[PDB]
Protein backbone atom coordinates (compact mmCIF):
# COMPACT_ATOMS: atom_id res chain seq x y z
CA UNK A 1 0.00 0.00 0.00
CA UNK A 2 0.95 3.68 0.26
CA UNK A 3 3.27 2.94 3.22
CA UNK A 4 5.26 0.70 0.88
CA UNK A 5 8.97 0.39 1.65
CA UNK A 6 8.56 2.47 4.82
CA UNK A 7 6.79 -0.46 6.51
CA UNK A 8 10.15 -2.30 7.08
CA UNK A 9 11.76 0.62 8.87
CA UNK A 10 9.91 0.19 12.14
CA UNK A 11 11.75 -3.02 13.11
CA UNK A 12 15.13 -1.41 12.39
CA UNK A 13 14.11 1.70 14.33
CA UNK A 14 13.11 -0.41 17.33
CA UNK A 15 16.51 -2.13 17.33
CA UNK A 16 18.50 1.09 16.95
CA UNK A 17 16.62 2.93 19.66
CA UNK A 18 17.05 -0.11 21.94
CA UNK A 19 20.82 0.08 21.35
CA UNK A 20 20.79 3.72 22.39
CA UNK A 21 18.64 3.13 25.47
CA UNK A 22 20.90 0.39 26.74
CA UNK A 23 24.15 2.11 25.80
CA UNK A 24 23.14 5.28 27.65
CA UNK A 25 22.82 3.25 30.86
CA UNK A 26 25.26 0.37 30.47
CA UNK A 27 28.45 2.24 29.59
CA UNK A 28 28.32 4.75 32.51
CA UNK A 29 27.23 2.01 34.91
CA UNK A 30 30.21 -0.18 33.98
CA UNK A 31 32.71 2.68 33.76
CA UNK A 32 31.36 4.25 36.92
CA UNK A 33 31.80 0.99 38.86
CA UNK A 34 35.22 0.19 37.39
CA UNK A 35 36.49 3.66 38.25
CA UNK A 36 35.35 3.20 41.84
CA UNK A 37 37.28 -0.09 41.96
CA UNK A 38 40.37 1.67 40.58
CA UNK A 39 40.03 4.51 43.10
CA UNK A 40 39.73 2.15 46.04
CA UNK A 41 42.19 -0.64 45.21
CA UNK A 42 45.26 1.24 46.56
CA UNK A 43 43.59 2.00 49.88
CA UNK A 44 41.80 -1.32 50.50
CA UNK A 45 41.91 -2.15 54.23
CA UNK A 46 43.11 1.31 55.23
CA UNK A 47 41.29 2.86 58.14
CA UNK A 48 38.84 5.73 57.87
CA UNK A 49 40.85 7.98 60.13
CA UNK A 50 43.96 7.69 57.97
CA UNK A 51 41.82 8.61 54.95
CA UNK A 52 40.40 11.66 56.73
CA UNK A 53 43.97 12.92 56.94
CA UNK A 54 44.91 11.64 53.44
CA UNK A 55 41.70 11.63 51.40
CA UNK A 56 41.41 10.09 47.97
CA UNK A 57 40.71 12.78 45.38
CA UNK A 58 42.23 11.08 42.30
CA UNK A 59 43.62 7.77 41.18
CA UNK A 60 46.76 6.84 43.12
CA UNK A 61 49.10 3.92 42.67
CA UNK A 62 51.29 1.49 44.49
CA UNK A 63 49.37 1.15 47.72
CA UNK A 64 47.59 -2.06 48.69
CA UNK A 65 48.59 -4.81 46.22
CA UNK A 66 51.33 -2.53 44.78
CA UNK A 67 49.57 -1.88 41.44
CA UNK A 68 49.75 1.01 38.94
CA UNK A 69 47.19 3.77 38.92
CA UNK A 70 43.95 2.70 37.24
CA UNK A 71 44.19 -0.95 38.23
CA UNK A 72 40.84 -2.65 38.87
CA UNK A 73 40.42 -5.80 40.90
CA UNK A 74 38.25 -8.91 41.18
CA UNK A 75 35.08 -6.76 41.36
CA UNK A 76 35.54 -5.57 37.79
CA UNK A 77 37.10 -8.84 36.56
CA UNK A 78 34.15 -11.01 37.66
CA UNK A 79 31.69 -8.45 36.32
CA UNK A 80 33.41 -8.67 32.94
CA UNK A 81 33.37 -12.46 33.17
CA UNK A 82 29.61 -12.40 33.64
CA UNK A 83 29.09 -10.03 30.68
CA UNK A 84 31.17 -12.34 28.52
CA UNK A 85 29.12 -15.39 29.55
CA UNK A 86 25.79 -13.68 28.91
CA UNK A 87 26.49 -12.68 25.31
CA UNK A 88 25.36 -16.09 24.08
CA UNK A 89 22.56 -16.35 26.59
CA UNK A 90 22.00 -17.17 30.24
CA UNK A 91 23.63 -20.47 31.19
CA UNK A 92 24.74 -21.02 34.79
CA UNK A 93 27.43 -23.47 33.78
CA UNK A 94 29.07 -21.00 31.40
CA UNK A 95 28.95 -18.37 34.17
CA UNK A 96 30.83 -20.47 36.69
CA UNK A 97 33.23 -21.64 33.95
CA UNK A 98 34.27 -18.05 33.24
CA UNK A 99 34.75 -17.37 36.97
CA UNK A 100 37.11 -20.33 37.23
CA UNK A 101 39.02 -18.98 34.22
CA UNK A 102 39.51 -15.68 36.02
CA UNK A 103 40.82 -17.47 39.11
CA UNK A 104 43.03 -20.03 37.33
CA UNK A 105 44.18 -18.22 34.18
CA UNK A 106 43.72 -14.52 34.77
CA UNK A 107 40.86 -14.17 32.32
CA UNK A 108 39.87 -10.48 32.29
CA UNK A 109 42.60 -9.22 34.60
CA UNK A 110 44.29 -5.89 33.94
CA UNK A 111 47.81 -7.24 33.31
CA UNK A 112 47.18 -10.98 33.16
CA UNK A 113 47.61 -11.74 36.86
CA UNK A 114 45.12 -12.31 39.65
CA UNK A 115 46.37 -9.98 42.38
CA UNK A 116 43.27 -10.39 44.55
CA UNK A 117 40.30 -12.68 44.97
CA UNK A 118 38.03 -13.04 47.97
CA UNK A 119 38.31 -16.05 50.25
CA UNK A 120 34.67 -17.19 50.05
CA UNK A 121 34.89 -16.84 46.28
CA UNK A 122 38.10 -18.86 46.01
CA UNK A 123 36.91 -21.61 48.34
CA UNK A 124 33.62 -21.90 46.45
CA UNK A 125 35.19 -22.07 42.99
CA UNK A 126 37.71 -24.66 44.22
CA UNK A 127 34.79 -26.81 45.37
CA UNK A 128 33.25 -26.56 41.88
CA UNK A 129 36.51 -27.64 40.29
CA UNK A 130 36.36 -30.79 42.45
CA UNK A 131 32.83 -31.84 41.42
CA UNK A 132 30.54 -29.96 43.76
CA UNK A 133 27.61 -28.87 41.64
CA UNK A 134 27.04 -25.20 40.88
CA UNK A 135 23.99 -25.36 43.14
CA UNK A 136 26.02 -26.62 46.12
CA UNK A 137 29.52 -25.12 45.90
CA UNK A 138 28.74 -21.73 47.46
CA UNK A 139 29.64 -20.90 51.04
CA UNK A 140 26.79 -21.23 53.53
CA UNK A 141 28.43 -20.30 56.85
CA UNK A 142 27.20 -17.30 58.84
CA UNK A 143 30.62 -15.73 58.19
CA UNK A 144 30.46 -16.40 54.47
CA UNK A 145 28.28 -13.26 54.12
CA UNK A 146 30.85 -11.19 52.30
CA UNK A 147 30.08 -8.77 49.48
CA UNK A 148 31.68 -10.85 46.71
CA UNK A 149 28.39 -11.68 45.00
CA UNK A 150 26.87 -8.21 44.95
CA UNK A 151 30.01 -6.85 43.29
CA UNK A 152 29.60 -9.09 40.19
CA UNK A 153 25.86 -9.21 39.39
CA UNK A 154 25.05 -5.79 37.90
CA UNK A 155 25.00 -7.20 34.33
CA UNK A 156 21.90 -9.19 35.33
CA UNK A 157 19.85 -5.97 35.32
CA UNK A 158 20.80 -5.35 31.69
CA UNK A 159 20.12 -8.97 30.76
CA UNK A 160 16.61 -8.65 32.17
CA UNK A 161 16.11 -5.39 30.31
CA UNK A 162 12.52 -4.23 30.22
CA UNK A 163 11.35 -7.53 31.71
CA UNK A 164 10.38 -6.06 35.08
CA UNK A 165 8.52 -9.13 36.27
CA UNK A 166 9.39 -11.16 39.36
CA UNK A 167 9.97 -14.71 38.20
CA UNK A 168 13.04 -14.64 35.98
CA UNK A 169 14.74 -11.96 38.10
CA UNK A 170 14.11 -13.95 41.29
CA UNK A 171 15.56 -17.12 39.80
CA UNK A 172 18.70 -15.87 38.11
CA UNK A 173 19.74 -13.48 40.88
CA UNK A 174 19.64 -16.36 43.37
CA UNK A 175 21.36 -18.82 41.02
CA UNK A 176 24.24 -16.50 40.16
CA UNK A 177 24.72 -15.36 43.75
CA UNK A 178 24.74 -18.90 45.14
CA UNK A 179 27.76 -19.91 43.07
CA UNK A 180 29.82 -18.28 45.81
CA UNK A 181 27.47 -16.85 48.48
CA UNK A 182 24.77 -19.33 49.45
CA UNK A 183 23.67 -17.95 52.82
CA UNK A 184 20.14 -16.46 52.65
CA UNK A 185 21.41 -13.23 54.18
CA UNK A 186 23.67 -12.80 51.15
CA UNK A 187 20.96 -13.80 48.66
CA UNK A 188 18.61 -11.23 50.18
CA UNK A 189 21.36 -8.64 49.73
CA UNK A 190 21.58 -9.50 46.05
CA UNK A 191 17.83 -8.96 45.65
CA UNK A 192 18.12 -5.56 47.36
CA UNK A 193 20.90 -4.43 45.04
CA UNK A 194 19.33 -5.74 41.84
CA UNK A 195 16.01 -4.11 42.69
CA UNK A 196 17.55 -0.69 43.35
CA UNK A 197 19.71 -0.83 40.23
CA UNK A 198 16.73 -1.98 38.16
CA UNK A 199 14.64 0.94 39.43
CA UNK A 200 17.38 3.38 38.43
CA UNK A 201 17.64 1.64 35.01
CA UNK A 202 13.87 2.23 34.70
CA UNK A 203 14.40 6.02 35.14
CA UNK A 204 13.15 6.51 38.67
CA UNK A 205 14.50 9.44 40.69
CA UNK A 206 16.91 8.05 43.27
CA UNK A 207 14.71 8.49 46.34
CA UNK A 208 11.72 6.87 44.63
CA UNK A 209 13.97 4.03 43.41
CA UNK A 210 15.04 3.46 47.01
CA UNK A 211 11.51 3.68 48.42
CA UNK A 212 10.06 1.35 45.79
CA UNK A 213 12.83 -1.18 46.48
CA UNK A 214 12.01 -1.16 50.20
CA UNK A 215 8.36 -1.96 49.55
CA UNK A 216 9.20 -4.61 46.97
CA UNK A 217 11.66 -6.50 49.16
CA UNK A 218 9.31 -6.47 52.16
CA UNK A 219 6.45 -7.68 49.94
CA UNK A 220 8.31 -10.56 48.28
CA UNK A 221 10.91 -11.75 50.80
CA UNK A 222 9.06 -11.97 54.12
CA UNK A 223 8.74 -15.80 54.05
CA UNK A 224 11.32 -18.43 54.96
CA UNK A 225 14.35 -18.42 54.38
CA UNK A 226 14.37 -14.60 54.25
CA UNK A 227 11.92 -13.67 57.02
CA UNK A 228 14.59 -14.18 59.66
CA UNK A 229 17.18 -12.24 57.66
CA UNK A 230 15.18 -9.05 57.15
CA UNK A 231 16.22 -7.76 60.61
CA UNK A 232 19.83 -7.44 59.47
CA UNK A 233 18.61 -5.13 56.68
CA UNK A 234 16.57 -2.82 58.92
CA UNK A 235 18.66 0.30 58.24
CA UNK A 236 18.13 -0.19 54.51
CA UNK A 237 14.60 -1.55 54.42
CA UNK A 238 13.01 0.46 57.28
CA UNK A 239 13.26 4.26 57.68
CA UNK A 240 15.59 6.50 55.60
CA UNK A 241 19.17 5.32 55.18
CA UNK A 242 20.05 8.79 53.97
CA UNK A 243 19.40 10.19 57.49
CA UNK A 244 22.32 8.21 58.92
CA UNK A 245 25.54 9.99 59.87
CA UNK A 246 28.97 8.86 58.72
CA UNK A 247 29.77 7.68 62.24
CA UNK A 248 26.84 5.22 61.94
CA UNK A 249 28.17 3.83 58.63
CA UNK A 250 30.34 0.68 58.75
CA UNK A 251 32.49 -0.10 55.71
CA UNK A 252 33.68 -3.69 56.10
CA UNK A 253 33.26 -6.42 53.47
CA UNK A 254 30.17 -7.73 55.27
CA UNK A 255 27.36 -7.69 52.73
CA UNK A 256 25.12 -5.62 55.03
CA UNK A 257 27.81 -3.04 55.84
CA UNK A 258 28.69 -2.76 52.15
CA UNK A 259 25.14 -2.24 50.93
CA UNK A 260 24.39 0.29 53.68
CA UNK A 261 27.54 2.21 52.89
CA UNK A 262 27.25 2.21 49.12
CA UNK A 263 23.55 3.11 49.01
CA UNK A 264 24.14 5.80 51.64
CA UNK A 265 27.02 7.29 49.67
CA UNK A 266 24.74 7.42 46.60
CA UNK A 267 21.66 8.83 48.30
CA UNK A 268 23.52 11.51 50.31
CA UNK A 269 25.54 13.04 47.43
CA UNK A 270 24.54 14.87 44.23
CA UNK A 271 27.10 13.91 41.58
CA UNK A 272 29.01 10.86 40.36
CA UNK A 273 32.37 12.18 41.53
CA UNK A 274 31.03 13.13 44.96
CA UNK A 275 29.42 9.71 45.41
CA UNK A 276 32.40 7.55 44.60
CA UNK A 277 34.91 9.68 46.52
CA UNK A 278 32.62 9.64 49.56
CA UNK A 279 32.42 5.85 49.32
CA UNK A 280 36.17 5.34 48.93
CA UNK A 281 37.03 7.58 51.87
CA UNK A 282 35.04 5.45 54.31
CA UNK A 283 38.01 3.11 54.45
CA UNK A 284 37.74 -0.61 54.86
CA UNK A 285 36.55 -2.42 51.75
CA UNK A 286 37.18 0.65 49.67
CA UNK A 287 37.37 -0.84 46.17
CA UNK A 288 34.14 -2.83 46.50
CA UNK A 289 32.08 -0.19 48.30
CA UNK A 290 33.21 2.30 45.67
CA UNK A 291 32.49 -0.12 42.80
CA UNK A 292 28.91 -0.66 44.06
CA UNK A 293 28.39 3.06 44.63
CA UNK A 294 29.86 3.79 41.18
CA UNK A 295 27.47 1.35 39.49
CA UNK A 296 24.53 3.16 41.11
CA UNK A 297 25.81 6.68 40.47
CA UNK A 298 27.03 5.79 36.99
CA UNK A 299 23.71 4.54 35.75
CA UNK A 300 21.92 7.45 37.40
CA UNK A 301 23.99 10.47 36.40
CA UNK A 302 25.22 8.90 33.12
CA UNK A 303 28.15 9.68 30.92
CA UNK A 304 28.33 13.46 31.23
CA UNK A 305 29.21 13.12 34.93
CA UNK A 306 31.98 10.50 34.58
CA UNK A 307 35.31 12.40 34.50
CA UNK A 308 37.23 11.82 31.30
CA UNK A 309 40.42 12.19 33.38
CA UNK A 310 39.42 8.99 35.20
CA UNK A 311 38.13 7.06 32.16
CA UNK A 312 41.44 7.55 30.39
CA UNK A 313 43.43 6.10 33.28
CA UNK A 314 41.52 2.77 33.43
CA UNK A 315 43.64 -0.20 32.46
CA UNK A 316 42.47 -1.85 29.22
CA UNK A 317 39.87 0.89 28.64
CA UNK A 318 39.50 0.05 24.95
CA UNK A 319 38.93 -3.66 25.64
CA UNK A 320 36.31 -2.82 28.28
CA UNK A 321 34.42 -0.58 25.86
CA UNK A 322 34.58 -3.32 23.22
CA UNK A 323 33.10 -5.79 25.70
CA UNK A 324 30.39 -3.29 26.56
CA UNK A 325 29.46 -2.94 22.90
CA UNK A 326 29.45 -6.70 22.33
CA UNK A 327 27.20 -7.14 25.37
CA UNK A 328 24.84 -4.40 24.17
CA UNK A 329 24.62 -6.04 20.73
CA UNK A 330 23.68 -9.35 22.33
CA UNK A 331 20.75 -7.77 24.20
CA UNK A 332 18.99 -6.43 21.11
Amino acid sequence: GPLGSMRGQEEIDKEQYQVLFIKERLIPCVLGAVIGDCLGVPVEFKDREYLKQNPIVEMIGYGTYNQPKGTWSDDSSLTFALMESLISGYDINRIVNNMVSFMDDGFWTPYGEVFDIGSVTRESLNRYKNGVSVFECGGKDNFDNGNGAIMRIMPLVFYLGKDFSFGKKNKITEEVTRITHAHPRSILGSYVYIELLQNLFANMDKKLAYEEMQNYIRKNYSDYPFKDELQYYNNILEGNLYELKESNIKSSGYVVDTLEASIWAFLTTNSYKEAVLKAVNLGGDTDTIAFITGSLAGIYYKMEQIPVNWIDQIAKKEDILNLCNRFIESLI
Partner: protein, 180 residues
Protein backbone atom coordinates in the same frame (compact mmCIF):
# COMPACT_ATOMS: atom_id res chain seq x y z
CA UNK B 1 -6.24 12.58 2.45
CA UNK B 2 -7.07 10.56 -0.76
CA UNK B 3 -4.22 8.86 -2.68
CA UNK B 4 -5.34 10.82 -5.78
CA UNK B 5 -5.21 14.08 -3.73
CA UNK B 6 -1.79 13.01 -2.36
CA UNK B 7 -0.40 12.28 -5.86
CA UNK B 8 -1.70 15.64 -7.29
CA UNK B 9 -0.19 17.41 -4.26
CA UNK B 10 3.15 15.67 -4.91
CA UNK B 11 3.16 16.54 -8.65
CA UNK B 12 2.13 20.20 -8.16
CA UNK B 13 4.60 20.73 -5.31
CA UNK B 14 7.59 18.50 -6.17
CA UNK B 15 7.74 18.00 -10.02
CA UNK B 16 10.28 20.88 -10.33
CA UNK B 17 12.24 19.59 -7.31
CA UNK B 18 12.43 16.05 -8.69
CA UNK B 19 13.33 16.88 -12.30
CA UNK B 20 16.16 19.10 -10.84
CA UNK B 21 17.82 16.32 -8.77
CA UNK B 22 21.34 15.16 -9.78
CA UNK B 23 21.79 11.45 -10.68
CA UNK B 24 23.66 10.90 -7.36
CA UNK B 25 20.80 12.59 -5.43
CA UNK B 26 18.29 10.24 -7.20
CA UNK B 27 20.45 7.14 -6.46
CA UNK B 28 20.71 8.14 -2.74
CA UNK B 29 16.87 8.38 -2.51
CA UNK B 30 16.55 4.95 -4.23
CA UNK B 31 19.27 3.53 -1.92
CA UNK B 32 17.35 4.82 1.15
CA UNK B 33 14.34 2.62 0.08
CA UNK B 34 16.70 -0.41 0.59
CA UNK B 35 16.33 -1.45 4.29
CA UNK B 36 20.06 -2.33 4.37
CA UNK B 37 21.11 1.23 3.30
CA UNK B 38 18.36 2.63 5.60
CA UNK B 39 19.87 0.90 8.65
CA UNK B 40 23.44 2.03 7.88
CA UNK B 41 22.43 5.68 7.22
CA UNK B 42 20.04 6.16 10.19
CA UNK B 43 22.15 3.96 12.51
CA UNK B 44 25.11 6.34 12.13
CA UNK B 45 23.00 9.54 12.38
CA UNK B 46 21.21 8.21 15.51
CA UNK B 47 24.49 6.99 17.09
CA UNK B 48 23.72 3.23 17.22
CA UNK B 49 26.64 2.82 14.75
CA UNK B 50 29.83 4.65 15.88
CA UNK B 51 32.06 4.28 12.77
CA UNK B 52 31.38 6.59 9.78
CA UNK B 53 32.18 4.69 6.52
CA UNK B 54 33.04 7.09 3.59
CA UNK B 55 30.36 5.46 1.30
CA UNK B 56 27.63 5.92 3.97
CA UNK B 57 28.92 9.51 4.40
CA UNK B 58 28.40 10.09 0.64
CA UNK B 59 24.85 8.58 0.57
CA UNK B 60 23.82 10.74 3.59
CA UNK B 61 25.39 13.84 1.95
CA UNK B 62 23.54 13.26 -1.36
CA UNK B 63 20.17 12.49 0.34
CA UNK B 64 20.48 15.61 2.57
CA UNK B 65 21.49 17.78 -0.45
CA UNK B 66 18.36 16.52 -2.23
CA UNK B 67 15.98 17.23 0.70
CA UNK B 68 17.61 20.68 1.44
CA UNK B 69 16.24 21.82 -1.97
CA UNK B 70 12.69 20.72 -0.98
CA UNK B 71 10.04 22.46 1.14
CA UNK B 72 6.42 21.54 1.91
CA UNK B 73 4.23 23.83 -0.28
CA UNK B 74 1.57 24.26 2.45
CA UNK B 75 0.46 22.83 5.88
CA UNK B 76 -0.37 19.00 5.67
CA UNK B 77 -1.09 16.11 8.14
CA UNK B 78 1.29 13.11 7.73
CA UNK B 79 1.51 9.68 9.41
CA UNK B 80 4.33 7.53 10.81
CA UNK B 81 4.43 4.05 12.41
CA UNK B 82 7.10 3.57 15.11
CA UNK B 83 7.98 1.81 18.41
CA UNK B 84 7.65 2.97 22.07
CA UNK B 85 11.49 2.62 22.33
CA UNK B 86 11.67 6.27 21.03
CA UNK B 87 9.81 7.34 24.27
CA UNK B 88 11.77 5.23 26.81
CA UNK B 89 13.92 8.17 28.09
CA UNK B 90 10.67 10.15 28.77
CA UNK B 91 8.95 7.45 30.91
CA UNK B 92 9.14 5.68 34.29
CA UNK B 93 9.34 2.21 32.65
CA UNK B 94 7.95 0.50 35.83
CA UNK B 95 5.09 3.10 36.26
CA UNK B 96 4.13 3.94 32.67
CA UNK B 97 2.12 7.20 32.33
CA UNK B 98 1.81 8.06 28.61
CA UNK B 99 -0.25 11.22 29.33
CA UNK B 100 2.93 12.74 30.88
CA UNK B 101 4.48 12.73 27.35
CA UNK B 102 2.26 15.74 26.47
CA UNK B 103 4.59 18.74 25.95
CA UNK B 104 7.75 16.66 25.39
CA UNK B 105 9.72 17.10 22.13
CA UNK B 106 10.88 13.99 20.18
CA UNK B 107 14.00 14.48 18.01
CA UNK B 108 14.77 12.27 14.97
CA UNK B 109 18.53 12.67 14.28
CA UNK B 110 18.20 10.49 11.17
CA UNK B 111 16.00 10.88 8.10
CA UNK B 112 12.26 10.69 8.92
CA UNK B 113 9.84 8.79 6.65
CA UNK B 114 6.09 9.68 6.75
CA UNK B 115 3.06 8.80 4.58
CA UNK B 116 0.20 11.09 3.44
CA UNK B 117 -2.28 8.15 3.75
CA UNK B 118 -3.94 7.53 7.16
CA UNK B 119 -6.16 4.62 6.03
CA UNK B 120 -3.50 2.00 6.77
CA UNK B 121 -2.56 -0.25 9.69
CA UNK B 122 1.01 0.70 10.71
CA UNK B 123 3.52 -1.85 12.08
CA UNK B 124 4.58 -1.28 15.74
CA UNK B 125 2.89 0.02 18.93
CA UNK B 126 3.09 3.80 18.24
CA UNK B 127 1.23 5.67 15.52
CA UNK B 128 2.12 9.35 15.06
CA UNK B 129 -0.13 11.97 13.45
CA UNK B 130 2.15 14.83 12.41
CA UNK B 131 0.94 18.36 11.75
CA UNK B 132 3.66 19.46 9.28
CA UNK B 133 3.80 23.22 8.52
CA UNK B 134 4.37 24.80 5.13
CA UNK B 135 8.03 25.30 4.48
CA UNK B 136 9.20 22.20 6.36
CA UNK B 137 12.26 20.43 4.93
CA UNK B 138 10.54 17.41 3.45
CA UNK B 139 9.89 16.12 -0.05
CA UNK B 140 7.18 13.98 -1.60
CA UNK B 141 8.68 10.84 -3.14
CA UNK B 142 6.85 9.29 -6.08
CA UNK B 143 8.38 6.58 -8.28
CA UNK B 144 11.47 6.21 -6.09
CA UNK B 145 10.62 2.89 -4.43
CA UNK B 146 9.70 -0.44 -5.98
CA UNK B 147 6.11 0.07 -4.71
CA UNK B 148 4.25 2.17 -7.30
CA UNK B 149 1.50 3.26 -4.89
CA UNK B 150 3.96 4.45 -2.22
CA UNK B 151 2.93 7.87 -0.87
CA UNK B 152 6.02 9.08 1.02
CA UNK B 153 7.13 12.43 2.44
CA UNK B 154 10.76 12.14 3.55
CA UNK B 155 12.21 14.71 5.87
CA UNK B 156 15.79 15.75 6.16
CA UNK B 157 17.72 14.93 9.34
CA UNK B 158 17.00 16.41 12.74
CA UNK B 159 13.24 16.90 12.75
CA UNK B 160 11.67 17.81 16.09
CA UNK B 161 8.11 16.97 17.07
CA UNK B 162 6.16 18.47 19.95
CA UNK B 163 3.71 16.05 21.54
CA UNK B 164 0.23 17.56 21.76
CA UNK B 165 -1.94 14.61 22.77
CA UNK B 166 -1.80 10.92 23.53
CA UNK B 167 -4.32 8.07 23.36
CA UNK B 168 -3.59 4.54 24.62
CA UNK B 169 -5.55 1.30 24.22
CA UNK B 170 -4.24 -2.22 24.87
CA UNK B 171 -0.61 -1.09 24.66
CA UNK B 172 -1.17 0.69 21.32
CA UNK B 173 -0.24 4.37 21.57
CA UNK B 174 -1.47 7.11 19.25
CA UNK B 175 0.49 10.38 19.42
CA UNK B 176 -0.49 13.73 17.83
CA UNK B 177 2.52 16.01 17.26
CA UNK B 178 3.41 19.37 15.72
CA UNK B 179 6.46 19.32 13.45
CA UNK B 180 8.66 22.19 14.58
Amino acid sequence: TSLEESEKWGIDGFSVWRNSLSSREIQAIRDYTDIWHYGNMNGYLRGSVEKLAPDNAERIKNLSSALEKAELPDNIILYRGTSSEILDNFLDLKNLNYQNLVGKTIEEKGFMSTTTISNQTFSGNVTMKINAPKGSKGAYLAHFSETPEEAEVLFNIGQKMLIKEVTELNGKIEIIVDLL
